Design a protein around this ligand. Sequence first.
Ligand SMILES: [Cl-]
Length: 162
Amino acid sequence: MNIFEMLRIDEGLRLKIYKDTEGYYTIGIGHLLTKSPSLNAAKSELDKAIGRNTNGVITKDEAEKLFNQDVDAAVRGILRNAKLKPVYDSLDAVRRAAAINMVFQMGETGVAGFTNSLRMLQQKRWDEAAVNLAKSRWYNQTPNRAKRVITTFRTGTWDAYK
Ligand SMILES: [Cl-]
Protein backbone atom coordinates (compact mmCIF):
# COMPACT_ATOMS: atom_id res chain seq x y z
CA MET A 1 0.00 0.00 0.00
CA ASN A 2 1.04 3.59 -0.77
CA ILE A 3 -0.58 7.02 -1.26
CA PHE A 4 -1.45 6.27 -4.91
CA GLU A 5 -3.14 2.94 -4.17
CA MET A 6 -4.87 4.53 -1.18
CA LEU A 7 -6.30 7.47 -3.10
CA ARG A 8 -7.13 5.15 -5.99
CA ILE A 9 -9.34 3.18 -3.58
CA ASP A 10 -10.97 6.29 -2.06
CA GLU A 11 -11.50 8.22 -5.31
CA GLY A 12 -12.18 5.44 -7.81
CA LEU A 13 -11.47 5.76 -11.52
CA ARG A 14 -13.95 7.15 -14.04
CA LEU A 15 -12.97 8.13 -17.58
CA LYS A 16 -15.97 10.37 -18.29
CA ILE A 17 -16.90 13.58 -16.51
CA TYR A 18 -18.88 12.78 -13.36
CA LYS A 19 -20.07 14.72 -10.33
CA ASP A 20 -18.17 14.13 -7.10
CA THR A 21 -19.72 13.64 -3.64
CA GLU A 22 -20.32 17.42 -3.44
CA GLY A 23 -21.96 17.58 -6.88
CA TYR A 24 -18.92 19.04 -8.63
CA TYR A 25 -17.69 18.06 -12.08
CA THR A 26 -14.75 15.74 -11.76
CA ILE A 27 -12.85 13.23 -13.88
CA GLY A 28 -10.34 10.38 -13.54
CA ILE A 29 -9.16 9.63 -10.03
CA GLY A 30 -10.95 12.42 -8.20
CA HIS A 31 -9.59 15.24 -10.33
CA LEU A 32 -11.93 18.13 -9.58
CA LEU A 33 -12.54 20.15 -12.74
CA THR A 34 -14.60 23.07 -11.44
CA LYS A 35 -17.20 24.02 -8.87
CA SER A 36 -19.19 25.66 -11.68
CA PRO A 37 -22.61 24.11 -12.47
CA SER A 38 -21.75 24.55 -16.16
CA LEU A 39 -20.82 21.28 -17.85
CA ASN A 40 -19.29 23.36 -20.66
CA ALA A 41 -17.07 25.14 -18.11
CA ALA A 42 -16.00 21.71 -16.82
CA LYS A 43 -15.30 20.38 -20.33
CA SER A 44 -13.15 23.46 -20.90
CA GLU A 45 -11.16 22.84 -17.70
CA LEU A 46 -10.73 19.21 -18.76
CA ASP A 47 -9.42 20.20 -22.19
CA LYS A 48 -7.08 22.67 -20.48
CA ALA A 49 -5.83 19.92 -18.12
CA ILE A 50 -5.23 17.31 -20.85
CA GLY A 51 -4.02 19.59 -23.66
CA ARG A 52 -6.54 18.48 -26.30
CA ASN A 53 -10.25 18.65 -27.14
CA THR A 54 -11.47 15.72 -25.03
CA ASN A 55 -15.26 16.13 -25.32
CA GLY A 56 -15.55 15.03 -21.67
CA VAL A 57 -13.77 11.68 -22.04
CA ILE A 58 -10.17 10.71 -21.25
CA THR A 59 -8.00 7.58 -21.31
CA LYS A 60 -6.70 5.66 -18.28
CA ASP A 61 -3.18 6.98 -18.95
CA GLU A 62 -4.48 10.56 -19.03
CA ALA A 63 -6.40 9.94 -15.78
CA GLU A 64 -3.24 8.58 -14.14
CA LYS A 65 -1.19 11.54 -15.38
CA LEU A 66 -3.59 14.03 -13.75
CA PHE A 67 -3.55 11.82 -10.65
CA ASN A 68 0.25 11.90 -10.44
CA GLN A 69 0.19 15.69 -10.81
CA ASP A 70 -2.56 16.04 -8.20
CA VAL A 71 -0.74 13.92 -5.59
CA ASP A 72 2.51 15.80 -6.31
CA ALA A 73 0.76 19.17 -5.97
CA ALA A 74 -0.98 18.05 -2.75
CA VAL A 75 2.29 17.09 -1.02
CA ARG A 76 4.12 20.17 -2.35
CA GLY A 77 1.28 22.34 -1.05
CA ILE A 78 1.70 20.83 2.42
CA LEU A 79 5.45 21.54 2.47
CA ARG A 80 4.85 25.08 1.19
CA ASN A 81 2.40 25.67 4.06
CA ALA A 82 4.09 27.05 7.20
CA LYS A 83 1.45 25.58 9.53
CA LEU A 84 1.06 22.20 7.80
CA LYS A 85 4.74 21.45 7.11
CA PRO A 86 5.84 20.89 10.75
CA VAL A 87 2.90 18.56 11.39
CA TYR A 88 3.62 16.62 8.19
CA ASP A 89 7.35 16.36 9.01
CA SER A 90 6.51 15.06 12.50
CA LEU A 91 4.60 12.12 11.01
CA ASP A 92 5.71 8.66 9.91
CA ALA A 93 5.26 7.66 6.24
CA VAL A 94 1.90 5.88 6.70
CA ARG A 95 0.27 8.83 8.49
CA ARG A 96 1.85 11.18 5.95
CA ALA A 97 -0.20 9.32 3.34
CA ALA A 98 -3.34 9.96 5.44
CA ALA A 99 -2.40 13.67 5.51
CA ILE A 100 -2.03 13.76 1.72
CA ASN A 101 -5.39 11.98 1.37
CA MET A 102 -7.20 14.70 3.33
CA VAL A 103 -5.46 17.53 1.45
CA PHE A 104 -6.34 15.80 -1.85
CA GLN A 105 -10.01 15.61 -0.86
CA MET A 106 -10.54 19.05 0.69
CA GLY A 107 -7.63 21.27 -0.28
CA GLU A 108 -5.52 23.22 2.23
CA THR A 109 -8.55 25.51 2.76
CA GLY A 110 -10.59 22.49 3.86
CA VAL A 111 -7.69 21.50 6.13
CA ALA A 112 -7.66 24.97 7.78
CA GLY A 113 -10.59 23.92 10.00
CA PHE A 114 -8.64 20.94 11.35
CA THR A 115 -6.19 23.02 13.42
CA ASN A 116 -7.10 21.20 16.64
CA SER A 117 -6.77 17.73 15.06
CA LEU A 118 -3.40 18.76 13.59
CA ARG A 119 -2.10 19.77 17.02
CA MET A 120 -3.07 16.37 18.45
CA LEU A 121 -1.45 14.66 15.46
CA GLN A 122 1.84 16.52 16.07
CA GLN A 123 1.55 15.54 19.75
CA LYS A 124 1.08 11.90 18.63
CA ARG A 125 -2.10 11.71 20.70
CA TRP A 126 -3.53 9.24 18.19
CA ASP A 127 -6.81 8.19 19.80
CA GLU A 128 -7.63 11.79 20.73
CA ALA A 129 -6.71 13.00 17.23
CA ALA A 130 -8.97 10.31 15.77
CA VAL A 131 -11.91 11.38 17.97
CA ASN A 132 -11.36 15.03 17.05
CA LEU A 133 -11.06 14.31 13.31
CA ALA A 134 -14.52 12.71 13.32
CA LYS A 135 -16.11 15.88 14.72
CA SER A 136 -16.29 17.39 11.26
CA ARG A 137 -18.50 17.99 8.24
CA TRP A 138 -15.93 15.84 6.40
CA TYR A 139 -16.69 12.79 8.55
CA ASN A 140 -20.45 13.30 8.39
CA GLN A 141 -20.54 13.73 4.60
CA THR A 142 -18.07 10.96 3.71
CA PRO A 143 -18.05 8.71 6.80
CA ASN A 144 -16.73 5.53 5.15
CA ARG A 145 -13.72 7.29 3.64
CA ALA A 146 -13.20 9.41 6.77
CA LYS A 147 -13.21 6.25 8.92
CA ARG A 148 -10.47 4.76 6.72
CA VAL A 149 -8.30 7.89 6.85
CA ILE A 150 -8.91 8.30 10.58
CA THR A 151 -7.98 4.65 11.26
CA THR A 152 -4.77 5.25 9.31
CA PHE A 153 -4.00 8.26 11.55
CA ARG A 154 -4.97 6.34 14.68
CA THR A 155 -2.88 3.23 13.97
CA GLY A 156 -0.13 4.21 11.53
CA THR A 157 -1.05 1.05 9.60
CA TRP A 158 -2.83 0.28 6.33
CA ASP A 159 -5.39 -1.93 8.11
CA ALA A 160 -8.36 0.13 6.86
CA TYR A 161 -7.28 -0.47 3.22
CA LYS A 162 -5.63 -3.91 3.39
CL1 LIG B 1 -17.02 2.57 1.06
